[PDB]
Amino acid sequence: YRRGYKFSTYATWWIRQAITRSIADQARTIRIPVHMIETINKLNRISRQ
Amino acid sequence: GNRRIRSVGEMAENQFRVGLVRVERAVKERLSLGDLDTLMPQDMINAKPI
Secondary structure, eight states: TTTTOOOHHHHHHHHHHHHHHHHHHHHHHSSOHHHHHEEEEEEEEHHOO | OOOOOOOOOHHHHHHHHHHHHHHHHHHHHHHHHSSSSSSOSSSSSSOOOO
């Protein structure tokens, strides 16, 4: 709290990370480690760009 | 007289509108949130659901 900020921001970072990785771990028949995943998201964005 | 056809443009219009809404969800989300001066209109678009 002494940082004095809104706690929303803190737990937003934390829980964003948690969920962002838990969907990647789970959510398929095959597990796919994360280097693939981040590479894939890059692709999905720059595809559209 | 109780009975009406359905040719193509009708159905095409239907699913097209649906794709528009599939995008529209994101549209609202990215309208109110993002920067206003600089967010291009096609910086919002993904035509893939369409």
